[PDB]
Symmetry: C3
Subunit: 445 residues, 3 copies
């Protein structure tokens, strides 16, 4: 295991502990986003602006419909006696594709039944007359229809239509139309270029609906405060499954993935702090998080994942290999841990763990309050430990802290420690270092 | 060239292929953004809030007008006999500048005739009375005037002004004024510090106009769906060219670049996959994209560029040098390619290219469906090729795929392959590795 | 010092100079954000939607109130004779925490008097009836109350309530409620998970108030155009200090930090340019900025700081150590500077400094205008210097520039220069380089 005793002596302290979770088997819901609203009540005046808008919508949606049909043409159902019944990808026709694209092509074909079901409700979809509405399909799944422009009209024009001239109606609706179209190009643009591979988060989808993703979740059937783990990590995503160029709408399938708890896997945080070396201040280099899975160590690359209050959530397993030298450190060999000189005025100089306080008392104030006496650590010792045995309250920096009883054998000593090699890391001077060391090899004879 | 036979044996597969495009000679259009609206119809009530707002505008715009004049003072036209007729930078007065800043200072002076043309229309600019409007200059270029607050007032106050008390008018317009000013500080803030160097995308400009960049493009005369290559890569950019502190407006010149297709240059994607090594799973390290230009290889740094469906588009040529060892890989010497151990549960285990499937059948399921038979690859072989000759349909993983005819001499074998060295990369343990290897040199005698 | 003479010979030119500033002792202001508005005038129709909303607010705020109480339970005031009077952290109860979290826990307890003062005004806070309002506390500090939903209602519903049916009122307010709730989850989500450690910028707070941060600054008492140094660098931040689950409001304390000018510390920019080497084009690798503090060199990592027109502003001192080899360069030893081959078509080929122009005239046009004659630099020389002595105006590239008098002894020569080692840097091929060099060590015997 981590053997935290040997780590504490070089300013690495046992931090928080988190569960590891991964995207599991997903549930799905159907949604339709309308590009062309139902113009009822303002049809008399907006005719000139609306006819321009319909052409813009048709021109934008035609390439998408072509790309979708071109993908469906490459997938055929397993009607033959083939025992692994499913769908077959025509690899000779698709030409070049990653496993992701091939899987997405199959998933698009698998999603086509929902597209047909939605298409049979086109007459109802064109008649919603409300900012957002829920409909029932022949498959008895519910369909959420988004109608943002109808919301803008129902709230800003229809209530005051008596005070607005017909010219004003034309101009105002024209502006609202162009505004909405710019929203769609901002949010859906990538998917409109490549609809098979691209996915969109529910937040980004909701940017086309005044960022009101909560209303979308509510109408699909989920409470936005309950889904926090899935919602905030960006795992609630959707993709295009069909498009209609005459009705002007995009059919999206939204995915609500469950989260599988990874068995016997734990993410451990490490808290680095400064330590004394012959009066100088040094810090040990180790990643902020390390993943222990069935006793095996690994590096998480946590920036691509979400650190919740109690778990780390990832789109897929992101564990990376770790160099033998670093594993030495994480297994108690203090002599292999790279260390770096402190230059910044401010660097963390103490930490609390299981009620014990570890501190670099040669570079920060440390005083026993029960005896109003300063605590001195010999210049050989790296870090001091504050214990319940000597004092109940200690001053550290400008704060007072109360601490617990030491759990090891005898008493803690930090002088007989095998320090590691000094290192400096930046892209710029790594090059200089590499070149300089290679000159020795170039000169070897 | 890439010699993809030798690459496939270590799990690098021929991906998609793209044109390389660069920002060319630009067209330009003129725009004015007004900070101060025309207050007609609400002039009676808003006076106290409006007089504060004019002071805030003047205080913001004065330093910009100073910085602009201080730059124009350093550029003088070539009225003397100088044979390379143009404009002269007073380098002793400018003091310290990059080539970019010197060029932008010259371009500001070159733009100043448009500033004079706009300034002679100031009387009309102060009268526009519509949310966005087009004017004709004396030079018979058109000017787009943006007037966002007049849009807010025309839509939300004037239609209901009978129902609002005069105090309510004052408060509501004071809020709209402060809101708009906070938009301007968000979007233009950098350019208001440094107007010569700074550039702003048309999207970011449109954040001052309810994100409606489509309406801006329409009025400048271009259709937002037609410009996608230039628009979405963020190459439609503007900069400040003049400011008026009493009328309270910013004059912008917006740049619509052409794209030049780079001659005899191609960007090639490389798809990595896992492969077997004696029962372990390994991946080869190569960049996702490489650029071949007149048979020269180079590294693109593609994150700074846009990958469209059919081209890679860049603000400038970004080709970087490449290490001899990696060129070795990309010219078929398998022995120099660094390789990394797979630790994640998920890494891509097959890919499709020109209708062939390459797969790592010791680490994923592979079966011939025409004979309902599992496919075995001998433990020396890195990857298996799936061919038309044996089967028309293969299962790979949980998908079925139909595949094309092999094109080489004889039949593919992937056992006699010269593997490269094992590597682990992160900044931290690059540090540890560098120090540890250098101890051999430090000890040599 | 930097010894710019030796640097210019390898295409490194003296750039701009900036002050170094750090976050100092902060002032503070109090703010309350209301989740539940006062429903006056629309209470008849919205009852069904409002009762749902109150439950959502309570469910969201209860965990926050629990986490806050759980933190306050660990801090006790120094009522005993302890001489360093203040507050004591119960480290045995807190368990594991970084110095930052411990300090924030103490700061939360120190902030609790303001929480009590605000809580005694709860009856007034629930009655604001205006989009934003200022109140006076018993401590005579002013409290800013944000009431966004009341603003939306006062501007879009109450002025036209005669034209809206009761059903329409219910639906429209329901949409506004869900929209606002989604804004709150977007902006405050992180703080609602971990309220002790998390901080929010005034801009992000204002996202819950139609991005109108200017109005917030105005009501708290500061002018948004005057605070630019603190405001734009993102240093105006607030954190949660109390929450009420019945009134449904979040109490925030906002921090306005002063900026301390760091004594005898200067940030110096370095402008790299190409230079000739035996007809090839090369660039020297050095960081864009370097920090000289009391004659000591250091690396700034400027991406984490704000580069204003005249100063660099940072949240804390971020100076990092620098390798001896790079310090050699920055101290005049030209032989240690890593250099890289130019491949991109465009790289900066000239620069202006103190009125002198440095240019790579073997790779760019250079002509004297007083004599209409090209300037030739011998293939041994790296960079040419343009001086007042020979010409008053020089053409460089496609621009004309006037230059000053050389200040050194004799005349400038760039041939007898000790060039450094060639280097190539990327994460991918650093691995290949490291592996290849280590094979020599593996083979040494
Ligand atoms: C292997 O790693 C060590 C790390 O300790 C490298 O040490 C470097 O050695 C040089 C020369 O001994 C140091 O140069 C400095 O020179 C000045 C002027 O003489 C002197 O005052 C300094 O005290 C120091 O000796 C350099 O600072 C040092 N660098 C580091 C980061 O420690 C060593 O170069 C590497 N081995 C080889 C063969 O390069
Ligand atoms: C330490 O650095 C030097 C450069 O200063 C490295 O030299 C490199 O050596 C290789 C192998 O000779 C060169 O690659 C190619 O070699 C073939 C056969 O000699 C030649 O025909 C090609 O034209 C090409 O030169 C390479 O160019 C050269 N330079 C660089 C920058 O890589 C040397 O490899 C390093 N030390 C060790 C032990 O590797
Ligand atoms: C140059 O590169 C080689 C790899 O090609 C480095 O080899 C690595 O060296 C360490 C120390 O000998 C090995 O660790 C030990 O491995 C054995 C067998 O797995 C294990 O029983 C020990 O407990 C310990 O972990 C490491 O495995 C080995 N790497 C490989 C892939 O075999 C070598 O260290 C480098 N040379 C220098 C001078 O740094
Ligand atoms: C539009 O025309 C219809 C015709 O049936 C009429 O009922 C309606 O009042 C008209 N509306 C406006 C705003 O002119
Ligand atoms: C403002 O004054 C004009 C007369 O100058 C009047 O016609 C208009 O109705 C007034 N508006 C208000 C809101 O008092
Ligand atoms: C709501 O009820 C009050 C009476 O308490 C009445 O004065 C008010 O006009 C009503 N509003 C609506 C919209 O029905």
């Amino acid at each position: 295991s981590l053997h935290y005793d040997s780590l504490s002596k070089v300013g690495i302290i046992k931090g928080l502990t988190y569960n590891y979770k991964i995207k599991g088997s997903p549930s799905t819901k159907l949604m339709v986003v309308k590009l062309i609203p139902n113009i009822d009540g303002v049809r008399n005046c907006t005719q000139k602006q609306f006819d321009e808008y319909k052409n813009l919508v048709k021109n934008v949606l035609e390439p998408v419909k072509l790309a979708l049909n071109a993908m469906l043409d490459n997938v055929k159902s397993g009607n033959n006696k083939y025992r692994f019944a499913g769908a077959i990808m025509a690899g000779v026709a698709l030409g070049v594709a990653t496993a992701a694209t091939v899987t997405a092509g199959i998933a698009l074909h698998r999603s086509n039944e929902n597209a047909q079901a939605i298409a049979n409700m086109k007459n109802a979809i064109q008649n919603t007359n409300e900012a957002v509405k829920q409909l029932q399909l022949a498959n008895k799944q519910t369909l959420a229809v988004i109608d943002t422009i109808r919301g803008e009209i129902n709230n800003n024009i229809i209530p005051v239509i008596n005070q607005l001239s017909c010219d004003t109606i034309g101009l105002s609706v024209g502006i609202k139309l162009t505004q909405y179209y710019s929203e769609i190009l901002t949010a859906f643009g990538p998917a409109l270029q490549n609809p098979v591979n691209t996915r969109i988060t529910i937040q980004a989808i909701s940017s086309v609906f005044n960022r009101n993703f909560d209303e979308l979740l509510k109408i699909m059937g989920y409470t936005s405060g309950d889904l926090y783990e899935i919602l905030h990590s960006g795992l609630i995503r959707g993709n295009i499954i069909d498009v209609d160029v005459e009705a002007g709408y995009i059919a999206l399938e939204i995915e609500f993935p469950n989260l599988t708890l990874v068995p016997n896997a734990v993410v451990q945080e490490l808290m680095p702090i400064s330590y004394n070396v012959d009066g100088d201040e040094w810090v040990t280099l180790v990643p902020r998080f390390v993943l222990t899975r069935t006793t095996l160590l690994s590096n998480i690359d946590t920036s691509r994942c979400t650190v919740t209050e109690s778990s780390v959530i990832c789109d897929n397993d992101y564990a990376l290999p770790m160099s033998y030298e670093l594993i030495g450190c994480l297994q108690g060999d203090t002599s292999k841990c790279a260390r770096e000189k402190v230059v910044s005025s401010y660097v963390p100089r103490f930490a609390l763990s299981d009620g014990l306080v570890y501190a670099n008392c040669l570079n920060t104030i440390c005083r026993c309050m029960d005896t109003d006496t300063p605590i001195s650590q010999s210049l050989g010792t790296t870090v001091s430990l504050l214990d319940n045995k000597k004092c109940l309250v200690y001053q550290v920096g400008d704060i007072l802290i109360s601490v617990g009883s030491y759990l090891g054998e005898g008493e803690y000593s930090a002088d007989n420690v095998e320090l590691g090699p000094p290192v400096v890391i930046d892209k710029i001077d790594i090059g200089n270092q590499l070149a300089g060391i290679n000159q020795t090899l170039q000169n070897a004879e």
